[PDB]
Amino acid sequence: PELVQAVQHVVIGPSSLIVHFNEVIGRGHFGCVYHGTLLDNDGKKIHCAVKSLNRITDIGEVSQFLTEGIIMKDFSHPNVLSLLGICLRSEGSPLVVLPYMKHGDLRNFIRNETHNPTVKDLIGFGLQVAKGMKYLASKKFVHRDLAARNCMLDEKFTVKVADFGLARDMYDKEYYSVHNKTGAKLPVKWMALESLQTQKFTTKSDVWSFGVLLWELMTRGAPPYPDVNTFDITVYLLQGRRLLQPEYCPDPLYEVMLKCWHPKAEMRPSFSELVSRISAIFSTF
Ligand SMILES: O=C1NCCCCn2cc(cn2)-c2cnc3ccc(cc3c2)CCn2nc(ccc2=O)-c2ccc1c(C(F)(F)F)c2
Protein backbone atom coordinates (compact mmCIF):
# COMPACT_ATOMS: atom_id res chain seq x y z
CA PRO A 1 0.00 0.00 0.00
CA GLU A 2 3.05 2.32 -0.16
CA LEU A 3 4.79 3.69 -3.27
CA VAL A 4 6.60 0.95 -5.15
CA GLN A 5 4.74 -2.28 -4.80
CA ALA A 6 7.05 -4.15 -7.09
CA VAL A 7 7.43 -6.55 -4.22
CA GLN A 8 4.58 -8.52 -5.68
CA HIS A 9 7.00 -10.60 -7.60
CA VAL A 10 8.15 -12.12 -4.32
CA VAL A 11 4.96 -12.03 -2.23
CA ILE A 12 4.00 -15.26 -0.45
CA GLY A 13 0.42 -15.99 0.56
CA PRO A 14 0.07 -16.38 4.33
CA SER A 15 -1.86 -19.63 3.83
CA SER A 16 1.21 -21.00 2.01
CA LEU A 17 3.53 -20.44 5.00
CA ILE A 18 3.65 -22.02 8.46
CA VAL A 19 5.89 -20.34 11.04
CA HIS A 20 6.91 -22.56 13.97
CA PHE A 21 7.11 -19.82 16.60
CA ASN A 22 8.06 -22.40 19.26
CA GLU A 23 11.51 -22.99 17.69
CA VAL A 24 13.86 -20.00 17.77
CA ILE A 25 17.04 -20.53 15.73
CA GLY A 26 18.35 -16.95 15.87
CA ARG A 27 17.80 -13.71 17.80
CA GLY A 28 18.48 -10.39 16.08
CA HIS A 29 17.73 -6.87 17.21
CA PHE A 30 14.87 -6.46 14.71
CA GLY A 31 13.35 -9.86 15.49
CA CYS A 32 13.84 -13.58 15.86
CA VAL A 33 14.50 -16.39 13.39
CA TYR A 34 12.09 -19.33 13.32
CA HIS A 35 11.71 -22.69 11.65
CA GLY A 36 9.21 -22.67 8.81
CA THR A 37 7.38 -24.73 6.23
CA LEU A 38 6.71 -23.22 2.80
CA LEU A 39 4.56 -24.50 -0.06
CA ASP A 40 6.57 -23.80 -3.21
CA ASN A 41 5.17 -22.52 -6.50
CA ASP A 42 5.14 -26.12 -7.77
CA GLY A 43 3.30 -27.39 -4.68
CA LYS A 44 6.08 -29.20 -2.79
CA LYS A 45 7.27 -28.88 0.79
CA ILE A 46 10.58 -27.31 1.76
CA HIS A 47 12.28 -26.33 4.97
CA CYS A 48 12.83 -22.59 5.34
CA ALA A 49 13.78 -19.94 7.88
CA VAL A 50 11.45 -17.07 8.76
CA LYS A 51 12.91 -13.76 9.95
CA SER A 52 10.51 -11.43 11.76
CA LEU A 53 10.96 -7.66 11.76
CA ASN A 54 8.44 -7.13 14.56
CA ARG A 55 10.70 -4.86 16.62
CA ILE A 56 10.91 -2.12 13.95
CA THR A 57 7.48 -0.46 14.23
CA ASP A 58 7.25 2.57 11.93
CA ILE A 59 5.70 2.60 8.45
CA GLY A 60 8.46 4.92 7.22
CA GLU A 61 11.30 3.08 8.96
CA VAL A 62 9.98 -0.23 7.59
CA SER A 63 9.53 1.05 4.02
CA GLN A 64 13.13 2.30 4.07
CA PHE A 65 14.39 -1.11 5.23
CA LEU A 66 12.35 -3.00 2.62
CA THR A 67 13.48 -0.82 -0.29
CA GLU A 68 17.11 -1.16 0.83
CA GLY A 69 17.04 -4.96 1.00
CA ILE A 70 14.77 -5.85 -1.92
CA ILE A 71 17.83 -5.78 -4.20
CA MET A 72 18.80 -9.26 -2.97
CA LYS A 73 16.08 -10.93 -5.06
CA ASP A 74 18.12 -10.11 -8.18
CA PHE A 75 21.30 -11.75 -6.87
CA SER A 76 22.02 -15.35 -7.87
CA HIS A 77 25.16 -17.20 -6.77
CA PRO A 78 25.73 -20.55 -5.00
CA ASN A 79 27.81 -18.83 -2.28
CA VAL A 80 25.31 -16.01 -1.61
CA LEU A 81 22.11 -16.40 0.41
CA SER A 82 19.04 -15.95 -1.79
CA LEU A 83 15.58 -14.61 -0.98
CA LEU A 84 12.66 -17.03 -1.06
CA GLY A 85 10.11 -14.23 -0.67
CA ILE A 86 8.36 -12.12 1.93
CA CYS A 87 4.96 -12.69 3.53
CA LEU A 88 2.87 -9.64 4.48
CA ARG A 89 -0.08 -10.19 6.82
CA SER A 90 -2.56 -7.84 8.46
CA GLU A 91 -1.28 -8.76 11.89
CA GLY A 92 1.74 -6.53 11.78
CA SER A 93 5.27 -6.74 10.45
CA PRO A 94 6.60 -8.33 7.32
CA LEU A 95 8.23 -11.76 7.39
CA VAL A 96 11.35 -12.67 5.39
CA VAL A 97 11.47 -16.25 4.08
CA LEU A 98 14.95 -17.69 3.48
CA PRO A 99 16.32 -21.15 2.62
CA TYR A 100 17.12 -23.32 5.62
CA MET A 101 20.78 -23.93 6.46
CA LYS A 102 21.30 -27.27 8.19
CA HIS A 103 24.48 -26.27 10.06
CA GLY A 104 23.71 -22.65 10.98
CA ASP A 105 26.44 -20.04 11.08
CA LEU A 106 29.98 -20.91 9.99
CA ARG A 107 31.62 -19.93 13.28
CA ASN A 108 29.42 -22.05 15.56
CA PHE A 109 29.93 -25.11 13.34
CA ILE A 110 33.73 -24.96 13.62
CA ARG A 111 33.74 -24.03 17.32
CA ASN A 112 31.78 -27.23 18.01
CA GLU A 113 34.08 -29.82 19.58
CA THR A 114 32.02 -32.74 18.20
CA HIS A 115 32.84 -31.72 14.61
CA ASN A 116 36.04 -32.74 12.82
CA PRO A 117 36.74 -30.45 9.85
CA THR A 118 40.15 -31.03 8.33
CA VAL A 119 42.60 -28.28 7.44
CA LYS A 120 41.52 -28.74 3.82
CA ASP A 121 37.89 -28.29 4.88
CA LEU A 122 38.62 -24.94 6.52
CA ILE A 123 40.64 -23.68 3.54
CA GLY A 124 37.77 -24.77 1.29
CA PHE A 125 35.30 -22.77 3.37
CA GLY A 126 37.37 -19.61 2.97
CA LEU A 127 37.58 -20.20 -0.78
CA GLN A 128 33.78 -20.44 -0.97
CA VAL A 129 33.47 -17.15 0.94
CA ALA A 130 35.91 -15.47 -1.46
CA LYS A 131 33.83 -16.63 -4.43
CA GLY A 132 30.69 -15.19 -2.86
CA MET A 133 32.33 -11.84 -2.17
CA LYS A 134 33.68 -11.78 -5.73
CA TYR A 135 30.09 -11.91 -6.98
CA LEU A 136 28.90 -9.14 -4.65
CA ALA A 137 31.88 -6.98 -5.66
CA SER A 138 31.12 -7.22 -9.38
CA LYS A 139 27.57 -5.97 -8.71
CA LYS A 140 29.07 -2.98 -6.82
CA PHE A 141 27.75 -4.13 -3.43
CA VAL A 142 29.63 -3.36 -0.20
CA HIS A 143 28.72 -5.73 2.65
CA ARG A 144 30.09 -3.91 5.75
CA ASP A 145 29.91 -6.83 8.18
CA LEU A 146 31.83 -9.81 6.89
CA ALA A 147 32.57 -12.38 9.60
CA ALA A 148 32.32 -16.09 10.33
CA ARG A 149 29.17 -15.50 12.39
CA ASN A 150 27.48 -14.01 9.29
CA CYS A 151 28.05 -16.93 6.90
CA MET A 152 25.75 -19.95 6.69
CA LEU A 153 26.40 -23.63 5.97
CA ASP A 154 23.80 -25.81 4.25
CA GLU A 155 23.34 -29.58 3.97
CA LYS A 156 25.87 -30.05 1.14
CA PHE A 157 28.64 -28.16 3.00
CA THR A 158 27.99 -25.09 0.83
CA VAL A 159 28.83 -21.73 2.42
CA LYS A 160 26.42 -18.84 1.85
CA VAL A 161 27.52 -15.28 2.50
CA ALA A 162 24.62 -13.93 4.54
CA ASP A 163 23.61 -11.02 6.80
CA PHE A 164 22.76 -8.57 4.04
CA GLY A 165 19.69 -7.05 2.45
CA LEU A 166 16.50 -8.08 4.22
CA ALA A 167 18.56 -10.42 6.45
CA ARG A 168 20.79 -7.67 7.87
CA ASP A 169 20.79 -7.61 11.68
CA MET A 170 22.91 -7.94 14.81
CA TYR A 171 22.94 -11.66 15.60
CA ASP A 172 25.60 -11.49 18.34
CA LYS A 173 25.60 -8.27 20.37
CA GLU A 174 28.92 -9.01 22.10
CA TYR A 175 31.18 -7.84 19.26
CA TYR A 176 29.39 -4.62 18.22
CA SER A 177 29.64 -1.04 19.44
CA VAL A 178 26.62 1.23 18.96
CA HIS A 179 27.82 4.68 17.92
CA ASN A 180 26.69 7.79 19.72
CA LYS A 181 25.02 10.23 17.27
CA THR A 182 24.89 8.14 14.08
CA GLY A 183 23.52 5.01 15.74
CA ALA A 184 25.68 2.80 13.52
CA LYS A 185 26.54 -0.74 14.63
CA LEU A 186 30.30 -1.23 14.42
CA PRO A 187 32.06 -4.63 14.65
CA VAL A 188 35.25 -3.16 16.07
CA LYS A 189 37.67 -6.08 15.79
CA TRP A 190 36.64 -6.82 12.18
CA MET A 191 36.92 -3.28 10.79
CA ALA A 192 39.67 -1.89 8.57
CA LEU A 193 41.93 0.75 10.10
CA GLU A 194 40.51 3.51 7.89
CA SER A 195 36.97 2.50 8.93
CA LEU A 196 37.70 2.90 12.64
CA GLN A 197 38.83 6.47 11.90
CA THR A 198 36.14 7.65 9.45
CA GLN A 199 33.24 5.14 9.72
CA LYS A 200 33.22 4.81 5.92
CA PHE A 201 33.09 1.42 4.21
CA THR A 202 34.32 0.17 0.82
CA THR A 203 35.04 -3.15 -0.85
CA LYS A 204 38.66 -2.72 0.26
CA SER A 205 37.45 -2.67 3.87
CA ASP A 206 35.49 -5.82 3.03
CA VAL A 207 38.84 -7.34 2.06
CA TRP A 208 40.26 -6.46 5.48
CA SER A 209 37.31 -8.20 7.14
CA PHE A 210 37.86 -11.20 4.87
CA GLY A 211 41.38 -11.60 6.26
CA VAL A 212 39.99 -11.66 9.80
CA LEU A 213 37.50 -14.29 8.64
CA LEU A 214 40.41 -16.41 7.36
CA TRP A 215 42.09 -16.11 10.77
CA GLU A 216 38.80 -17.23 12.33
CA LEU A 217 38.74 -20.37 10.17
CA MET A 218 42.34 -21.47 10.81
CA THR A 219 41.79 -21.12 14.58
CA ARG A 220 38.37 -22.84 14.47
CA GLY A 221 36.43 -19.93 15.93
CA ALA A 222 38.86 -18.12 18.22
CA PRO A 223 37.98 -14.49 19.06
CA PRO A 224 40.33 -11.97 17.44
CA TYR A 225 42.74 -9.91 19.59
CA PRO A 226 41.86 -11.44 22.99
CA ASP A 227 44.48 -9.31 24.80
CA VAL A 228 43.67 -5.88 23.30
CA ASN A 229 40.71 -3.81 24.47
CA THR A 230 38.46 -1.85 22.11
CA PHE A 231 40.27 1.45 22.73
CA ASP A 232 43.84 0.23 22.11
CA ILE A 233 42.80 -1.59 18.91
CA THR A 234 43.46 1.47 16.73
CA VAL A 235 46.92 2.29 18.10
CA TYR A 236 47.81 -1.42 17.98
CA LEU A 237 47.00 -1.33 14.25
CA LEU A 238 48.78 1.99 13.65
CA GLN A 239 51.98 0.42 15.02
CA GLY A 240 51.91 -2.17 12.23
CA ARG A 241 51.01 -5.00 14.62
CA ARG A 242 48.60 -7.61 13.26
CA LEU A 243 47.04 -10.94 14.17
CA LEU A 244 49.59 -13.70 14.66
CA GLN A 245 49.79 -16.83 12.52
CA PRO A 246 47.85 -19.83 13.90
CA GLU A 247 49.69 -23.03 14.74
CA TYR A 248 48.11 -25.03 11.90
CA CYS A 249 48.02 -22.32 9.22
CA PRO A 250 50.05 -23.04 6.07
CA ASP A 251 52.54 -20.27 5.38
CA PRO A 252 51.10 -19.16 1.98
CA LEU A 253 47.71 -18.74 3.67
CA TYR A 254 49.10 -16.44 6.36
CA GLU A 255 50.68 -14.33 3.61
CA VAL A 256 47.24 -13.88 2.03
CA MET A 257 45.91 -12.63 5.37
CA LEU A 258 48.82 -10.18 5.67
CA LYS A 259 48.02 -8.86 2.19
CA CYS A 260 44.44 -8.21 3.34
CA TRP A 261 45.60 -5.98 6.23
CA HIS A 262 47.80 -3.52 4.33
CA PRO A 263 47.66 0.06 5.70
CA LYS A 264 46.65 1.47 2.30
CA ALA A 265 43.21 0.24 1.26
CA GLU A 266 44.35 0.50 -2.36
CA MET A 267 47.36 -1.78 -1.82
CA ARG A 268 45.06 -4.66 -0.81
CA PRO A 269 44.15 -7.44 -3.27
CA SER A 270 40.80 -7.68 -4.98
CA PHE A 271 38.41 -10.55 -4.35
CA SER A 272 39.18 -11.78 -7.87
CA GLU A 273 42.86 -12.00 -6.92
CA LEU A 274 41.89 -13.76 -3.68
CA VAL A 275 39.94 -16.42 -5.59
CA SER A 276 43.02 -17.16 -7.70
CA ARG A 277 45.46 -17.36 -4.78
CA ILE A 278 43.32 -19.42 -2.39
CA SER A 279 42.41 -21.97 -5.04
CA ALA A 280 46.04 -22.62 -5.74
CA ILE A 281 46.75 -23.39 -2.13
CA PHE A 282 43.70 -25.70 -2.03
CA SER A 283 44.80 -27.74 -4.98
CA THR A 284 48.28 -28.54 -3.75
CA PHE A 285 50.23 -29.40 -0.54
O1 LIG B 1 22.66 -18.02 17.06
C2 LIG B 1 23.08 -18.45 16.06
N3 LIG B 1 23.64 -19.79 16.01
C4 LIG B 1 23.69 -20.61 17.21
C5 LIG B 1 23.59 -22.10 16.75
C6 LIG B 1 22.87 -22.21 15.35
C7 LIG B 1 21.44 -22.70 15.49
N8 LIG B 1 20.84 -22.76 14.18
C9 LIG B 1 20.69 -21.71 13.39
C10 LIG B 1 20.04 -22.20 12.21
C11 LIG B 1 19.89 -23.59 12.39
N12 LIG B 1 20.38 -23.87 13.60
C13 LIG B 1 19.67 -21.38 10.94
C14 LIG B 1 19.28 -22.11 9.81
N15 LIG B 1 18.97 -21.48 8.69
C16 LIG B 1 19.02 -20.13 8.57
C17 LIG B 1 18.68 -19.55 7.34
C18 LIG B 1 18.71 -18.18 7.20
C19 LIG B 1 19.09 -17.38 8.28
C20 LIG B 1 19.42 -17.94 9.50
C21 LIG B 1 19.38 -19.36 9.65
C22 LIG B 1 19.74 -19.99 10.90
C23 LIG B 1 19.11 -15.87 8.05
C24 LIG B 1 19.59 -14.98 9.23
N25 LIG B 1 21.03 -14.95 9.51
N26 LIG B 1 21.37 -15.53 10.64
C27 LIG B 1 22.63 -15.59 11.06
C28 LIG B 1 23.67 -15.00 10.31
C29 LIG B 1 23.28 -14.38 9.09
C30 LIG B 1 21.92 -14.37 8.72
O31 LIG B 1 21.61 -13.85 7.74
C32 LIG B 1 22.82 -16.30 12.38
C33 LIG B 1 21.88 -17.27 12.72
C34 LIG B 1 21.99 -17.94 13.90
C35 LIG B 1 23.04 -17.65 14.77
C36 LIG B 1 23.98 -16.68 14.44
C37 LIG B 1 25.15 -16.32 15.37
F38 LIG B 1 26.04 -17.33 15.43
F39 LIG B 1 25.75 -15.21 14.91
F40 LIG B 1 24.70 -16.08 16.61
C41 LIG B 1 23.86 -16.00 13.23
Where along the chain do its domains lie? Answer: 9-100, 101-285
Alpha carbon distance 157, 125 (integer Å): 9
Whole-angstrom CA distances from 151 to 13, 22, 43, 213, 231 are: 28, 24, 29, 10, 27
The finding on whether 221 has its CB within 6 A of some atom of ligand 1 is no
Catalogue the active-site residues: 145
CA–centroid distance for 274 within its chain: 18
Task: Give alpha helix (H) positions in the chain.
Answer: 59-69, 106-111, 119-138, 193-198, 203-218, 233-238, 251-260, 271-282
Q: Could you tell me which CATH class the domain 101-285 is placed in?
A: mainly alpha
Q: Indicate which technique resolved this structure.
A: X-ray
Task: Give alpha helix (H) positions in 42-186.
Answer: 59-69, 106-111, 119-138
Q: Which residues are annotated as a binding site for ATP?
A: 25-33, 51
Alpha carbon distance 265, 208 (integer Å): 8
Give the number of the atom of ligand 1 that is nearest the alpha carbon of residue 100: 15
The finding on whether 162 has its CB within 6 A of some atom of ligand 1 is yes
Query: Residue 275: beta bridge partners?
Result: none
Alpha carbon distance 147, 205 (integer Å): 12
Which of 48, 152, 216 to mutate to test ligand 1, by most ligand atoms within 8 A of the CB atom?
A: 152
CA–centroid distance for 263 within its chain: 24
The finding on whether 171 has its CB within 6 A of some atom of ligand 1 is yes
CA of 117 to the centre of ligand 1 (A): 19
The finding on whether 194 has its CB within 6 A of some atom of ligand 1 is no
